[PDB]
Amino acid sequence: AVSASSRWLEGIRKWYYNAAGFNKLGLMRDDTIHENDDVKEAIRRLPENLYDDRVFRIKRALDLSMRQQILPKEQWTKYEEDKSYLEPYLKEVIRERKEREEWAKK
Template identity: 55%
Template sequence: RDDLLYENEDVQEALRRIPAHVVDERNFRMIRAIQLSMQKIILPKEEWTKFEEDKLYLTPMVEQVKKERLERENWEK
């Protein structure tokens, strides 16, 4: 689910803060999805990520970035 987030400024900042290997894994999944889409190939069902196994690796950091941004905006008022 986190791979589908729209990359606004908060998401981009969150991506800078998470470990590089997590960003690399994310990029691999996105490249693979684009490649399979271009080739009109469906990922084999046994390789699908189950909902229970889908870990939110980016959402907590995005929420932290948003919280910091809102706090900074409130201080600047």
């Protein structure tokens, strides 16, 4: 029954991303995740392109942070372009491990 609320949420989501640093930074939302054991394995599963990309992005990002400089307005990550490229990989890794637990449990 979500038509107006969810619609507001969709608008809100763009604002949330805009509110979020990653969009401002220009780095992808997927790249931002707390590097833990599951993320870690997902990470490892990335293709050369995807994966080298995430290395430059973070390189460019930690460079900026070191210099307290923001990227130009023209070169920023736009919410409409939410590459959730880790998501696919990250889901399974979890999926596998949740199972593992099920098999281990019984």
